[PDB]
Every structure is written in C-alpha cells, then in structure tokens.
Amino acid sequence: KIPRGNGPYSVGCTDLMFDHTNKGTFLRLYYPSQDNDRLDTLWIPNKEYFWGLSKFLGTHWLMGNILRLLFGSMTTPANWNSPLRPGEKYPLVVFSHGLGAFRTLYSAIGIDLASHGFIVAAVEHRDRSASATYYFKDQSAAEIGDKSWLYLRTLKQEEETHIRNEQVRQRAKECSQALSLILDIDHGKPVKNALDLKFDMEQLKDSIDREKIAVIGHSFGGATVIQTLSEDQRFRCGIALDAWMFPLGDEVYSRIPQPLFFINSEYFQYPANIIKMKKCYSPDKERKMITIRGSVHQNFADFTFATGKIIGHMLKLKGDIDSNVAIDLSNKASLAFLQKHLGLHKDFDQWDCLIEGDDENLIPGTNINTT
Numbered sequence: 001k002i003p004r005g006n007g008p009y010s011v012g013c014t015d016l017m018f019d020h021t022n023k024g025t026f027l028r029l030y031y032p033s034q035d036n037d038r039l040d041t042l043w044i045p046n047k048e049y050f051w052g053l054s055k056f057l058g059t060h061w062l063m064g065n066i067l068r069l070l071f072g073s074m075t076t077p078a079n080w081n082s083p084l085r086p087g088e089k090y091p092l093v094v095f096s097h098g099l100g101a102f103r104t105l106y107s108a109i110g111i112d113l114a115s116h117g118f119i120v121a122a123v124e125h126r127d128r129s130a131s132a133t134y135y136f137k138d139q140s141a142a143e144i145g146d147k148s149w150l151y152l153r154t155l156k157q158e159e160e161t162h163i164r165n166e167q168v169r170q171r172a173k174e175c176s177q178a179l180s181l182i183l184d185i186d187h188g189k190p191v192k193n194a195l196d197l198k199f200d201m202e203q204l205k206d207s208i209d210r211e212k213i214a215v216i217g218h219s220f221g222g223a224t225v226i227q228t229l230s231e232d233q234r235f236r237c238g239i240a241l242d243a244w245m246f247p248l249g250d251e252v253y254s255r256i257p258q259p260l261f262f263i264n265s266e267y268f269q270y271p272a273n274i275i276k277m278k279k280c281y282s283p284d285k286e287r288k289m290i291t292i293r294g295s296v297h298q299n300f301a302d303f304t305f306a307t308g309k310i311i312g313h314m315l316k317l318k319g320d321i322d323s324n325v326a327i328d329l330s331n332k333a334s335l336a337f338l339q340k341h342l343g344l345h346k347d348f349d350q351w352d353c354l355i356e357g358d359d360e361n362l363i364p365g366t367n368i369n370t371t
C-alpha cells in the first residue's frame with residue numbers, strides 16, 4: 001500500500017488536461033477534499049504506461065502486460081473526484097517526475113502534501129522523459145477519446161548533453177504553464193478539461209493562496225526545480241528530491257535567488273552530482289541539504305511501496321531503511337521547509353530540526369566527499 005497522508009485533511013484526486021495538444025498542460029491534481037467516501041485512485045490508469053515502462057526497463061512488449069497483470073488494479077489512497085474542501089486558500093506545489101516516470105507515480109508525496117493543506121499539481125512531461133504520456137491530435141480526437149501516445153526517447157551517448165538540457169528546459173516551461181493554468185482557474189477562467197471527468201474545475205475558483213507557490217520534483221524533476229526557479233520568480237522556493245543535476249546548463253547555477261532544499265538518498269549520490277549541487281550554494285542564498293541514511297533513489301517514488309521487502313531490495317526500490325520511515329522524513333522536512341519560505345502559519349515548524357538533518361536516520365549535508 002502507498003501510505004495515507006499524515007495530515008488533518010482528507011485527500012482528493014483528479015486529472016487535468018488543458019489544452020488537449022502535445023503542447024498543452026497535463027497534470028494530476030491532489031487537493032484537500034470535503035468527503036472521504038469516493039473510490040480510491042487507480043495508480044497506473046492506462047495499459048500504455050505499462051508498455052512504456054517495459055521499454056524503459058528494457059524488456060519485451062510482453063513484460064509490460066505482465067506488469068499490467070501484477071499492478072494494473074493497484075490504487076492510491078486519494079478520493080477520486082471528491083469535491084475540493086471549501087473555505088480556505090491553499091498554497092500550491094508543482095511536482096516534476098523522474099526519468100521513466102509520469103504524473104501518477106509520486107502519490108505518497110502528493111497525498112501527504114494535500115493532507116496538510118496543499119493543492120499539488122503533479123505534471124506529466126511531453127519531453128519524452130516520461131515512460132509514456134498522451135494527448136489528442138485535434139479537437140475531434142479529444143472529443144471521441146482517441147489518444148495519441150508519446151513514448152520515452154532513448155538517447156545515443158552523443159545526444160546526452162544537448163538533449164537532456166532541451167528537456168529540462170521544456171520541463172521548466174511545462175511547470176510554468178501548469179502554474180499559469182492553475183492561477184487562471186483560480187482567477188475564475190473557465191477551462192474545458194480535455195478529459196471528461198465528473199470534477200467541476202470551477203471549485204478551484206478562489207481556492208489558491210496565490211503568493212505561496214513552490215516547485216518540488218524528484219531526479220530529472222530535481223533539476224526541473226532548479227531550472228524552473230531560475231526562469232520563474234513566481235515559484236517562491238524549491239525542493240529537489242535526489243536531483244540528477246546533469247541536464248542543467250552551466251548558466252543556471254549562479255541564477256537562483258529562491259530558497260532551495262536538497263533531500264538526497266545515501267546510495268544514489270556521487271561526486272560530479274554533489275559538485276553541481278555545490279555550484280548552487282552562495283552566502284546571500286538559502287540552501288539546505290540532507291541525506292536520508294539507508295536510502296536509495298526510488299525511495300521518493302511510489303514504487304517503494306509497490307512490493308515486499310526482499311523483491312524491493314533486489315530491484316533497488318527499497319533500501320536498508322523502512323520506506324514509510326524514509327518518506328515520513330522527506331515529507332516532514334519538506335513541510336517545515338515550505339512553512340519557513342512560503343510564510344505558512346501552520347505547525348510544520350515542529351519538524352525544523354529535520355531541515356538540519358538532526359535525526360538518527362538523517363545526515364546533515366552529504367556523505368559524499370569531494371575536493
């Protein structure tokens with residue numbers, strides 16, 4: 001089971017596509033909900049995601065159908081299409097996924113942020129870093145649910161530097177565009193969802209705390225945080241979860257005024273990556289780093305809960321640390337950080353020592369020795 005949120009609020013979930021094109025916004029939305037009696041949300045909702053996942057794991061079209069058999073009915077503990085909880089302005093997180101992932105695969109983070117009173121826009125990237133995504137060729141395809149599938153792009157060694165930077169840059173623009181879309185919805189603009197779903201987008205009118213916006217992401221999404229913050233001053237802080245810094249151009253590192261928090265795993269990180277994180281440090285800027293002890297790259301993704309301990313460890317989805325333990329540390333430190341830098345008036349400051357990695361499962365800064 002993906003763990004339920006630890007915060008006071010019930011959690012809802014819906015999908016938003018606007019516009020219907022490969023250049024429009026695709027996001028999954030987690031939000032505080034009025035009721036707690038809807039059906040749970042389908043974790044991986046289409047078979048083409050499983051196919052895109054098999055291709056990414058380097059297996060047959062056939063193995064994709066085996067993953068669909070084992071995982072195709074799995075839900076996440078979010079009320080599918082619940083009415084949004086009224087009477088409060090919610091701060092907003094935009095979430096960017098890792099390479100080979102897509103919008104649905106960080107529900108343990110998205111569900112927990114929402115239970116504490118956030119709206120979470122987990123975006124699906126059309127940069128061919130997702131395992132699979134979809135859009136509609138035109139208005140007619142949009143209406144009759146004729147989906148066009150975009151699958152993960154495999155690079156040559158040659159293409160790496162250039163293409164990953166193009167992608168981190170498209171990701172940033174997709175984060176900005178997702179933010180602009182939500183703000184318009186808030187500012188009352190009627191948007192016709194390209195997906196026919198029994199959730200009225202009008203509910204979101206006057207629901208956003210327009211000044212309290214952050215960008216969070218994992219892996220490629222960690223670099224998306226950094227690129228995003230450098231382009232969009234609307235994002236007031238960022239949290240890079242096990243950032244893979246390689247996509248970033250040399251120019252970004254000196255150009256991030258916003259508070260920025262690195263939550264790293266113990267076993268992913270490496271000198272070249274840490275050095276790139278250090279390139280972001282400055283005395284005039286807010287910068288914080290923790291390492292979760294006993295943890296691995298996928299400890300931030302839902303895959304960490306998808307299996308038992310032995311299969312999980314073998315496939316590098318679980319570490320020596322319990323997954324709920326590791327996600328609680330990441331989520332709770334995130335909560336305290338977001339409170340500090342968005343000016344929230346909640347109890348998240350109860351977790352301030354986590355920002356400094358004062359905990360037995362936390363390392364202050366990094367374990368990685370450099371120069």
Ligand SMILES: Cc1ccccc1-c1cc(C(=O)N2CC=CC2)ccc1C
Pocket residue numbers: 053056057067071098099100101298303306307315316317
């Ligand atoms: C556990 C799981 C459930 C359903 C679909 C895929 C997977 C899976 C996932 C990864 C993984 O670590 N990934 C990170 C990004 C994309 C896949 C590795 C192996 C498997 C079997």
Ligand SMILES: [Ca+2]
Pocket residue numbers: 176231232233
């Ligand atoms: Ca901009």
Ligand SMILES: [Cl-]
Pocket residue numbers: 265267268295296297298316
């Ligand atoms: Cl790892």
